[PDB]
Design a binder for this molecule. Structure first.
Ligand SMILES: OC[C@H]1O[C@H](OC[C@H]2O[C@H](OC[C@H]3O[C@H](OC[C@H]4O[C@H](OC[C@H]5O[C@@H](O)[C@H](O)[C@@H](O)[C@@H]5O)[C@H](O)[C@@H](O)[C@@H]4O)[C@H](O)[C@@H](O)[C@@H]3O)[C@H](O)[C@@H](O)[C@@H]2O)[C@H](O)[C@@H](O)[C@@H]1O
Ligand SMILES: OC[C@H]1O[C@H](OC[C@H]2O[C@H](OC[C@H]3O[C@H](O)[C@H](O)[C@@H](O)[C@@H]3O)[C@H](O)[C@@H](O)[C@@H]2O)[C@H](O)[C@@H](O)[C@@H]1O
Ligand SMILES: OC[C@H]1O[C@H](O[C@H]2[C@H](O)[C@@H](O)[C@@H](O)O[C@@H]2CO)[C@H](O)[C@@H](O)[C@@H]1O
Ligand code: BGC
Ligand code: BGC
Ligand code: GLC
Ligand code: CA
Ligand code: CA
Ligand code: CA
Ligand code: MG
Ligand code: MG
Ligand code: MG
Ligand code: MG
Ligand code: MG
Ligand code: MG
Ligand code: MG
Ligand code: MG
Ligand code: MG
Ligand code: MG
Ligand code: MG
Ligand code: MG
Ligand code: MG
Ligand code: MG
Ligand code: MG
Ligand code: MG
Ligand code: MG
Ligand code: NI
Ligand code: NI
Ligand code: NI
Lengths: 1247, 458
C-alpha cells in the first residue's frame, strides 16, 4: 500500500523516459513513461523491474503513433516532460507524478501518501471536477445519471445492457485509462481518483497483470475520447443498412415475416432489417441445431432463396446467437456439438451443464374452491381415467413462482383439488373404484378426500449442506414424516433418491450408497416411491449389484408384510392413525422419546431405525420401555436404553428392525404386486408377552368402498405368555366379505411345545413345518429359527367360532440347520419369461418341488437367510444333475461372487446330491444367490432343491470399525490391507478402547484372534477386559516400521451364554498405539475367514479416494492419466459399480494407453493363485484391452476384455507363484473414447 | 384484546352449556360449550351474540357423536362440567375456563389476563409440557424437530411438502384445535399456548369467522389424534395397491415404461405402480390438452389398451396434474379451456395468467477466449451466413441465471464472441461484407470487432 521511492536513475530517449526507483533491494522498481501523442502519456510501472505481463484485450494490439518529439529534462528536480499540449512533472524524492496543461494548470497528481503501486493507481485532483465513465446501468438496476463524483462501483462488462471499464475522465481536462480485467475504480468529493486491481471480481479474472500499465489523456472530452479509441481501438464501419430501422421479433415464421415486410412497404414506412429470435434456428437439436436454419419456420432457408428474396425487398436478416451449445437433444442423447466441444476443451471455465427453457406457453390457475369449478375439472378428467390414469398426482396446489408471478394458493386448495377428484370418481364409478391421490401440502380436513402427502423437491444428498444448502436431503426426512404424523397426516412419502441436484436435471443421481440406504428407509414409510428430476432414472439395477440386491431384499420384507400393513390402512379410516408413528405416541412420558426421530414405529409391533449415515459402521438406537427382539439377528434387548448396533458398511445389507415383545405380525409369501394371486395361508408371527396383546386381521376387496357398508372380514388374534404355556386366541370371523385366507400358520416364538391343545383336544403333531403345511386339517410342529425355539400351529381361518390354542411343555429341536426350500425363494432371469422355474417332474425332492430353468443365461434363485453373527457358514446345496457330466453355477453372497460351484452328475434327474460351500455371511439378513452366469463361464443346467444354513457359524468375526469406540478411538482407511470397510486407530490416549459385543451359545473357553497392525517398530500393549472382569495384558509385536502389515494376536477368553463384552483398551500402564481390524471368535482353532481371502488391497476400489492404495498407474510419458475411481452416478443413465459404491474407470476422448497394476507378496510361495475381476467395456473397440498377471515366476498371462457394455467376469486361474509375489494389472490401448470399468478384483489362494 | 367479563346466565341442556357474558352493552357475549365425547369439548365464542360464521372446510360437515350424558352443575362458582375423562371448570367472575382430567390434574387454563376473545384463544399450561403439531418443514427450509415449545410459525398448508394447521397438542394430556383459515399459533416456555386469527396471511384468507370455534381434547396422544380425526375427518381407505412400490418418472414414453416394468418383473422386484409426469398428457395444446393422453408418447392410450395391458402386468398408472389450464397454446391462440374457464369464472382469485415453461433443454457455455474455439464457432456459422444471417445478435454473453445455475461470463466475453464473428466473416468474404453485431454488455476494446450495445430486457 506504500508509494514509490526515490528516483535513483532517469534515462531519456526520444519520447520515452525510464525511471529507476529505490525500493531497498538490488532489484529496483522501473517506471517507463512513453509520450504517445502530444496529449496521451503511457505509464508502465514494473515492480522490481520484472518483465511486464501481456496486455489485456482492452488494448488494441495494432495501436500505432507518429513520433511526438517531446522534450524531456532530467537535469533537475522535478524531471519534466513537455509537449505543446501537456507538461508532466516527476518529483525525485519520493517519485510523484504531476500532470499539467502546457500552460501550467494543474490537472492531477499523485499525493504524498502514495500514487502508483503494485495493485493500482491513485491520483488527487480538483474536488469540484466532474468525473465520467466507469459504469452504466443495466435493465434490473436503478438508473442514475452521468456523474461519477462519488463512485465505488466496480469496472465490469456487467449484464443486461450494462457497460463499464477502468476509464475515468473529467470535463476539467484529463482522463485515466488502466489496462485491467475488472477492478475497482474509486472517486470521492475530496478529489480522489483511484483504481485498484483488488481481489478476483464476481465475473472472474483470466488476465492477470504483475505490472501496472495505464494511460493519461489531456484535453476536452472529444480529445479524451479520441485518445481512448487510439489505445483501445476505433470502431470498424457497420454496413450502411444498419442506420435503418430494424424490427426484432420472437415468435415469427416465413409467412409472418413476408406479411410484416409487405405491411411496411405498402405504407412507405422505411425498414432495412428483421432480426429473428429462436424461431430462425433448430435450437435444441443435434448436429449443431443452434447454428442451422429452422426450415419448419423458414422453408425457403433450405437454400439461399429466402436471403435473396428478402434482399430483393430491401430486407437484411439478423439472427439471435447464444454463446452455448445444446449438450442433450430432445431424446436425451449426447449431441455431436457436445462431443466436439468436450473433446477439444471449448466450454467456458467454471460453467457446467445446466437447464434452459425456450418454448413458452401461457397458463392460469383454476379455483378448486367452487363446486361448479370442481365439477368441470372432474368432467374433463373422465377420459384420462377410463384410459388408465387411476391415481392423481396433484402437484403445485401450493404456490407458483413464474417471473413476476409469485401466486399463493389458499390453505384449502389441496383439500378442494382432492375433493374434485374424490367426489367425481366416486360418483362416476358408483363408489366402485377407490380414489388415490398425492399432494405436496396438507392442511386439516384434506384427508377426507383421499390424499397422501409427499415432501416435495428434496435434495439428492445425505443431509442439508452435504452437497448444497438450499434443500434438505435424506437425513432430514424422518423429521418431516413424523411432523406430518403429528398433524394427522400419516399417509406420507418422499422422492426416494432425491429430486434436486447441483446443475438441475443434468446434475448427479444419488451415489449407490445414498440410493440403497434411501430405498431401505423408504420401504418402512407409508407411501413408498422413487422419483427424480427430468430424464433421471431411479430403477435399482442402474446403481450396481448391491443397490439392486439390497433394494430387492427390503422390498421383499415390505411385501411379505402386506397383511400387517393393510390393517393400519383400515385403522386410518376409523381413527386417522396410520402405518407410522413417532415413539412419543406410545411413550408420552419418556423424555428420550420427546424429540426422537432416528427410529419410529412401523405399525404397532415393529421399531425401525434405517442406516442414514454415509460410511456408517455402527448406530446408536434408542429402545423405549419393553423387550425388543432383533428381527434379522435374533437377539433380545431390554428396553429403556440406547444400544450400540454394529452394521456392515461393506455389504449395506442391514436394516435395523426390532420386534416389540407382544408382537402379533401377520405376513405372507412375497408377491410381485398386491393382487397377483389369492393368498390362502397367512403366517402369524407371535412373540408373546406376559400381558395379553392382540392384532385384528383384516381383509376386504382392496378396490371399492364396499367396506363402508360392512363388506369386509376381520378376525381378532390375541396372545399371552402364561406361567408355563402360551395361549393364543383366534376369535370368530366377523363381517360379510368372504376372505381368501383359508389357514393361519401361527409361529409362536420362545417355546417349542410338547403339546398343543384346543377345546379339550390335543392337536396332531407333525415332524416339522413342511409336514405340517402339507397336512390337511389342523396340527402343530416345532423347530428352531433365528429367535430360538418355535411352535407352529396350523388352524382354519374364518370359522364361525373362536379357537383358543395353548402351547405347553418344552421340547427343543435338535436341528443344527435352517432349511430353505428354493421353490419358495425368489426366482429371476434376464427377461420376464426366462426366470428360473418351479417343477415337480422328477422324483426325490424335498418340500413341494424344486427349481429348474437354470439353463437360460441369467436365470437365478435367491434365498434370504438370517445369521445371528458374521462369520463362516458351511451352506449345503441339494441339487440334481442328470446331464452326464459336471455343471457350474455361481454362488453370490451379498452381491459378491464367492465361488463357481462345480456340481457333479448325480446319475439321473431323479437322483440328488449335496455340495457344501463355506459362505462369508454377515450378521442379520444375507442374500444368497445361485445363478447361471454365462458371462462368468458358468454352464448352468441343474435343478436345485434346497439349501441348509447352520444356526451357528464354524467361526465368527466382529469388525473393529463396527465396535463401540471410546476415548478417542476412531475408524480410518489411511493404511493398506485392512479387511472389511475400515479399521480402528487412535488408540493413543489412556482410556481409548474398542469394545466388541460377542455372542456364545454356552459358557466355556473360546479362542480369540485379533487382527492388528503395529508399525512403531517395537512391541506395544493393550488390556483385554472380558465382561468387565480383571484386565489382562495383550502384548502386540511389531513387524517393523510399516503400518500396511497386519498380524493375528491369539488368546483365550471365558465367556457366558449369550452376549459378552470383550474390550481392548489402553489402560494406564499400557502403551497403546496400535490399529485394530477384526476380532475372530471360535470354540475350535481359528483359521482363515471366508470374508478375508482376497490378497489385494482396495481390490473393490471402495476406499474413499482421498486415501491411496497399493494400486499404481501408468500411461505414456506426456499423456494425461485416463484413470480414475468414482461411482458413475454423474452419468444419465448411471454407469454404476459392479458392487457397492465405486469402480475404477479408464476413459479419454483422444487416443490413449493406460494401466493400473498392483504387486503383492503372497502368503505361501511355490503355490497356486487365481485372479478374478468384474470388467465392463463400451464405446470404441480398443486395439488392446486385457487383465494381466506377471512377475509370478512364469511368463505373462493375459485375459482379453470384450467390448459389450455389460459387466463380465474375467478369471486367470492356475497362477503358479515361485517368485514370492504377483503383479496383477489391467491395460487398455485405445484410438479414443473406449471406456473400461473395473471392479471387484480378487487374488486368492486357489485349491 | 380483552378477556371475557362476568357470567350473567348459564343454561344447561343435555351435553350443552350456554353462557351469557357481560360486555357492558345490551348485546351480551355468548359462549356455547358442547361435550361431544367423554374426552372432546367444542367451544363456540360468539362476540355480542352474533350468529356464528360458517365453519371452514377443516371441519367434517358429516361429523356426529353419540350422547355422552355429561354432568353440568351450574349451582355454584365455578360452574362444573364432568365426564369420566375430564372436568371443565368455568369460573363466573370473570369467565375463565380451566381444563382438568377427571382425577383433578390441571391440564390447561385461561389466565386472569384473558382467555378466549374475538380474534383467538389464549391458554396457560405447565411450562415444561412438550408441544407438538402446528407445522412441518418444506423442501427449501432448515428442518427442525418435532417439538414446538417456542413456536411462532404460522398455521398454513405452505408449499413444497409443508404441512400445518391450527392444532397444538401435548404429551402432557391435552390438545387444542381451532377452526380457522390460516392464522398464528404461539407457544413459549413460560407456558403460553395461544392462537390468533391475525391479519390476512401470505396465502390469503377466503373463510372469515366472526365467532371463535375451537375444540379441547383430553387424553394420551392416540386419543388426541382420534379426536382430531372425529372433528376434521378420517381418511378413506386407499386402494391396496398403494401399499406397494411406485416408480414416479419425468422423461418417459410407452417403450421405456414397458422396458422398466419388464426389468422389475424379470428380477422379481415387486412394483405396483408407475407415475407419469408431463409426458403422459398433451399439456400445452388446445381442446383440454392438459387433461388428454399424449398418444405420441403413449400410442396405446388412444384406447383402453395401455391401461389393460399394464393391468395385466400388475401395473396401475398415476398421472401428474397441475391446477391450471393453458390459456394460449404453443401457437399463441386462445384455447377452448380458456374460453370455458373465463366465461364461467373458474380462475383462482388474484391469479392472472402468466407465461410459463415446461420443456427442459440441457446446455453449456462456450469459451470465446480461445482462438481454436472462435475458429470452431465461426466455421459452424458459415452455412447460416450464406443462407441469410448477415447480422449477429449475440445475446447472453454476460451472465446465466437458470435455476441453480448463476454463471458469469468474463469481461472480455463480449469482445471475444464479437471477434469470432468479425475475424471469421472478414476472412470468409475476403473483407467484402461488413460485419454487424449487437451484444448486451460492453467493456473497453470490444468495439474493435464491430459490435453495438443494446440496453437489455427493459
Ligand atoms: O430440471 C427441471 C427443473 O426442475 C425443478 O423445477 C420443477 C419445475 O420445472 C418446470 O418449471 C421450470 C421453471 O419454469 C419457470 O421458469 C422458467 C424460466 O423462466 C424465465 O426465463 C424464460 C426464458 O426467458 C427468455 O427471455 C430467455 O431467452 C430464456 O433463456 C428463458 O428461459 C426465467 O427468467 C428463468 O430464470 C427461468 O428458468 C418457473 O418460473 C420456475 O419457477 C420453474 O423452476 C415445471 O413447469 C414446473 O411445474 C416444475 O415445478 C427445478 O427447481 C428447476 O430449476 C429445474 O429447471
Ligand atoms: O437343462 C437342464 C434340464 O435338463 C432336462 O430338461 C431338458 C429340457 O427339457 C424340456 O424341453 C424339452 C424339449 O422341448 C422342445 O421339444 C424343444 O424343442 C427342445 O429343444 C427341448 O429340449 C424343458 O422345456 C427345458 O426347459 C429343458 O431344458 C431335465 O429334465 C430338467 O429337469 C433340467 O432342468
Ligand atoms: O470423465 C470421467 C468419467 O469417465 C467415464 O464416463 C464416460 C462414459 O464412460 C462414456 O460412455 C461417455 O458417456 O462419456 C463419459 C465421460 O464424461 C466414467 O464412466 C465416469 O465414471 C467418469 O466420471
Ligand atoms: O412436473 C415436473 C415436476 O414438477 C414439480 O413441481 C414437482 O414437485 C415434481 O415432483 C415434478 O416432477
Ligand atoms: O431469446 C429470447 C430473449 O432472450 C433474452 O436473453 C434477450 O435479452 C431478448 O432480447 C430475447 O428476445
Ligand atoms: O500406510 C499407508 C501408506 O503406505 C505407503 O507407505 C505409501 O507410500 C503411503 O503413501 C501411504 O499413506
Ligand atoms: Ca424343494
Ligand atoms: Ca476391518
Ligand atoms: Ca466396487
Ligand atoms: Mg512513439
Ligand atoms: Mg499484483
Ligand atoms: Mg459538484
Ligand atoms: Mg410474431
Ligand atoms: Mg411477397
Ligand atoms: Mg430442421
Ligand atoms: Mg471428455
Ligand atoms: Mg456406538
Ligand atoms: Mg495411522
Ligand atoms: Mg509392495
Ligand atoms: Mg352430542
Ligand atoms: Mg374477528
Ligand atoms: Mg423441556
Ligand atoms: Mg426416463
Ligand atoms: Mg411387453
Ligand atoms: Mg395428441
Ligand atoms: Mg371475457
Ligand atoms: Ni455495473
Ligand atoms: Ni469422453
Ligand atoms: Ni411452514
Amino acid at each position: 500500500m506504500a508509494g514509490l521511492g526515490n528516483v535513483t536513475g532517469a534515462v531519456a530517449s526520444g519520447d520515452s523516459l525510464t525511471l529507476t526507483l529505490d525500493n531497498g533491494t538490488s532489484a529496483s522498481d522501473i517506471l517507463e513513461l512513453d509520450v504517445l501523442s502530444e496529449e496521451l502519456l503511457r505509464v508502465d510501472y514494473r515492480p522490481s523491474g520484472a518483465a511486464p505481463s501481456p496486455s489485456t484485450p482492452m488494448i488494441d494490439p495494432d495501436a500505432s503513433w507518429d513520433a511526438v518529439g517531446a522534450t524531456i529534462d532530467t537535469s533537475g528536480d522535478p524531471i519534466v516532460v513537455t509537449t505543446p499540449r501537456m507538461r508532466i512533472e516527476i518529483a525525485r524524492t519520493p517519485a510523484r507524478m504531476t500532470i499539467k496543461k502546457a500552460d501550467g494548470t494543474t490537472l492531477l497528481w499523485e499525493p504524498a501518501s502514495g500514487g502508483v503501486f503494485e495493485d493500482g493507481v491513485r491520483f488527487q485532483r480538483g474536488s469540484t471536477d466532474n468525473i465520467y465513465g466507469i459504469r452504466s446501468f443495466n435493465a434490473q438496476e436503478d438508473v442514475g445519471g452521468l456523474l461519477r463524483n462519488s463512485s465505488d462501483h466496480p469496472a465490469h462488462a456487467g449484464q443486461q445492457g450494462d457497460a463499464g471499464g477502468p476509464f475515468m475522465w473529467s470535463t476539467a481536462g484529463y482522463g485515466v485509462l488502466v489496462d485491467s480485467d475488472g477492478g475497482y475504480p474509486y472517486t470521492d468529493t475530496t478529489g480522489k481518483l483511484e483504481f485498484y486491481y483488488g481481489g478476483t471480481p464476481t465475473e472472474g479474472r483470466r488476465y492477470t497483470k504483475t505490472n501496472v500499465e495505464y494511460y493519461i489523456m489531456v484535453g476536452e472530452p472529444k480529445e479524451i475520447m479520441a485518445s481512448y479509441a487510439q489505445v483501445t481501438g476505433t470502431a470498424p464501419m457497420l454496413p450502411k443498412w444498419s442506420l435503418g430501422f430494424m424490427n426484432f421479433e420472437w415468435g415469427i415464421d416465413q409467412d409472418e415475416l413476408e406479411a410484416h415486410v409487405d405491411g411496411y412497404r405498402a405504407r412507405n414506412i422505411p425498414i432495412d432489417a428483421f432480426a429473428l429470435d429462436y424461431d430462425w434456428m433448430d435450437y435444441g437439436e443435434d448436429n449443431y441445431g443452434e447454428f442451422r436454419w429452422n426450415t419448419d419456420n423458414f422453408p425457403d432457408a433450405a437454400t439461399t432463396q429466402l436471403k435473396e428474396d428478402m434482399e430483393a425487398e430491401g430486407i437484411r436478416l439478423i439472427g439471435i446467437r447464444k454463446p452455448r451449445i445444446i449438450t442433450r437433444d430432445f431424446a436425451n442423447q449426447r449431441t455431436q456439438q457436445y462431443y466436439d466441444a468436450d473433446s477439444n476443451g471449448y466450454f467456458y471455465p467454471g460453467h457446467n451443464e445446466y437447464t434452459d427453457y425456450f418454448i413458452p406457453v401461457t397458463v392460469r390457475s383454476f379455483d378448486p374452491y367452487q363446486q361448479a369449478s370442481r365439477d368441470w375439472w372432474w368432467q374433463h378428467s373422465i377420459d384420462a381415467f377410463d384410459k388408465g390414469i387411476v391415481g392423481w398426482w396433484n402437484d403445485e396446489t401450493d404456490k407458483v413462482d413464474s417471473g413476476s408471478a409469485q401466486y399463493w394458493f389458499g390453505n384449502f386448495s389441496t383439500g378442494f383439488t382432492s375433493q374434485a377428484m374424490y367426489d367425481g370418481q366416486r360418483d362416476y364409478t358408483n363408489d366402485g373404484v377407490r380414489v388415490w391421490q398425492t399432494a405436496r401440502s396438507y392442511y386439516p380436513g384434506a384427508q377426507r378426500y383421499a390424499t397422501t402427502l409427499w415432501s416435495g423437491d428434496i435434495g439428492t444428498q445425505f443431509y442439508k449442506g452435504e452437497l448444497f444448502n438450499w434443500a434438505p436431503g435424506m437425513q432430514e426426512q424422518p423429521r418431516i414424516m413424523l411432523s406430518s404424523a403429528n398433524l394427522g397426516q400419516p399417509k406420507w412419502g418422499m422422492d426416494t433418491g432425491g429430486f434436486n441436484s447441483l446443475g438441475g436435471a443434468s446434475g448427479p443421481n444419488p451415489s449407490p450408497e445414498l440410493y440403497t440406504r434411501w430405498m431401505q428407509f423408504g420401504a418402512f414409510t407409508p407411501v413408498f416411491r422413487v422419483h427424480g428430476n427430468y430424464n433421471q432414472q431411479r430403477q435399482p439395477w442402474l446403481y450396481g449389484a448391491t443397490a439392486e440386491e439390497a433394494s430387492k431384499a427390503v422390498m421383499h420384507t415390505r411385501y411379505s408384510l402386506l397383511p400387517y400393513m393393510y390393517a393400519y390402512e383400515r385403522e386410518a379410516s376409523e381413527t386417522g392413525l396410520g402405518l407410522i408413528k413417532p415413539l412419543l405416541f406410545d411413550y408420552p412420558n419418556d423424555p428420550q422419546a420427546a424429540d426422537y426421530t432416528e427410529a419410529w414405529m412401523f405399525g404397532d409391533w415393529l421399531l425401525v431405525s434405517p442406516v442414514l449415515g454415509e460410511a456408517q459402521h455402527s448406530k446408536q438406537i434408542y429402545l423405549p420401555a419393553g423387550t425388543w427382539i432383533d428381527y434379522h439377528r435374533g437377539q433380545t434387548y431390554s428396553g429403556g436404553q440406547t444400544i450400540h448396533y454394529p452394521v456392515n458398511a461393506d455389504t449395506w445389507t442391514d436394516v435395523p428392525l426390532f420386534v416389540k415383545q407382544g408382537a402379533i405380525i401377520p405376513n405372507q409369501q412375497v408377491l410381485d404386486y398386491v393382487d397377483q394371486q389369492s393368498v390362502t395361508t397367512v403366517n402369524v408371527d407371535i412373540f408373546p408377552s406376559a400381558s395379553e396383546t392382540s392384532f385384528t386381521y383384516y381383509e376386504d376387496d382392496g378396490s371399492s368402498y364396499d367396506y363402508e357398508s360392512g363388506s369386509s372380514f376381520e378376525q381378532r388374534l390375541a396372545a399371552q405368555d402364561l406361567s408355563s404355556s402360551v395361549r393364543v386366541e383366534v376369535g370368530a370371523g366377523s363381517g360379510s366379505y368372504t376372505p381368501d385366507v383359508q389357514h393361519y400358520v401361527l409361529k409362536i416364538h420362545g417355546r417349542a411345545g410338547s403339546a398343543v391343545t384346543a377345546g379339550g383336544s390335543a392337536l396332531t403333531g407333525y415332524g416339522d413345518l413342511q409336514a405340517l403345511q402339507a397336512a390337511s386339517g389342523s396340527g402343530w410342529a416345532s423347530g428352531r429359527d433365528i429367535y430360538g425355539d418355535v411352535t407352529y400351529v396350523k388352524l382354519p381361518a374364518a370359522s364361525g367360532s373362536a379357537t383358543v390354542v395353548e402351547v405347553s411343555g418344552s421340547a427343543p429341536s435338535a436341528a443344527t440347520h435352517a432349511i430353505y426350500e428354493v421353490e419358495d425363494a425368489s426366482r429371476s432371469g434376464a427377461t420376464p419369461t426366462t426366470r428360473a422355474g418351479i417343477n415337480t417332474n422328477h422324483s426325490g425332492y424335498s418340500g413341494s418341488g424344486f427349481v429348474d430353468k437354470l439353463d437360460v443365461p441369467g436365470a437365478a434363485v435367491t434365498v434370504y437367510a438370517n445369521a445371528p453373527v458374521s462369520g463362516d457358514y458351511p451352506v449345503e446345496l441339494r441339487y440334481a444333475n442328470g446331464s452326464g457330466s459336471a455343471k457350474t453355477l455361481s454362488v453370490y453372497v451379498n452381491a459378491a461372487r464367492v465361488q463357481q460351484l462345480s456340481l457333479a452328475d448325480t446319475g439321473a434327474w431323479s437322483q440328488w446330491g449335496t455340495q457344501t460351500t463355506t459362505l462369508p455371511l454377515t450378521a442379520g439378513q444375507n442374500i444368497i444367490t445361485y445363478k447361471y452366469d454365462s458371462d462368468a463361464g458358468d454352464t448352468g443346467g441343474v435343478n436345485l432343491d434346497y439349501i441348509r444354513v447352520p444356526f451357528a457359524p464354524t467361526q465368527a468375526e466382529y469388525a473393529a470399525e463396527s465396535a463401540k469406540l471410546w476415548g478417542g478411538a476412531g475408524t480410518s482407511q489411511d493404511h493398506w490391507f485392512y479387511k472389511g470397510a475400515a479399521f480402528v486407530d487412535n488408540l493413543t490416549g489412556v482410556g481409548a478402547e474398542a469394545s466388541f459385543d460377542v455372542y456364545a451359545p454356552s459358557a466355556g473357553t473360546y479362542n480369540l484372534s485379533l487382527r492388528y497392525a503395529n508399525g512403531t517398530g517395537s512391541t506395544k500393549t493393550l488390556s483385554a477386559i472380558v465382561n468387565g472382569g480383571a484386565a489382562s495384558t495383550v502384548t502386540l509385536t511389531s513387524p517393523g516400521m510399516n503400518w500396511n502389515l497386519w498380524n493375528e494376536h491369539t488368546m483365550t477368553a471365558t465367556l457366558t451364554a449369550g452376549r459378552n463384552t470383550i474390550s481392548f483398551r489402553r489402560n494406564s500402564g499400557n502403551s497403546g498405539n496400535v490399529n485394530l481390524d477384526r476380532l475372530a471368535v471360535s470354540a475350535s482353532a481359528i483359521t482363515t475367514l471366508a470374508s478375508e481371502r482376497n490378497l489385494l488391497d482396495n481390490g473393490d476400489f471402495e476406499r474413499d479416494t482421498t486415501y491411496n492404495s497399493n494400486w499404481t498407474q501408468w500411461q505414456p510419458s506426456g499423456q494425461p492419466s485416463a484413470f480414475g475411481i468414482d461411482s458413475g452416478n454423474a452419468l444419465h443413465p448411471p454407469e454404476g459399480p459392479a458392487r457397492r459404491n465405486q469402480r475404477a474407470y479408464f476413459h479419454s476422448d483422444n487416443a490413449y494407453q493406460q494401466s493400473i497394476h498392483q504387486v503383492v507378496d503372497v502368503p505361501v510361495n511355490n503355490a497356486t493363485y487365481r485372479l478374478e475381476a468384474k470388467v465392463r467395456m463400451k464405446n470404441t473397440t480398443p486395439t488392446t484391452a486385457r487383465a494381466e498377471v506377471q512377475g509370478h515366476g512364469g511368463s505373462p498371462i493375459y485375459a482379453n476384455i470384450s467390448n459389450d457394455g455389460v459387466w463380465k467376469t474375467i478369471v486367470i486361474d492356475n497362477i503358479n507363484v515361485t517368485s514370492g509375489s504377483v503383479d496383477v494389472g489391467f491395460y487398455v490401448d485405445s484410438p479414443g473414447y473406449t471406456t473400461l470399468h473395473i471392479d471387484e478384483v480378487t487374488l486368492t489362494r486357489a485349491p
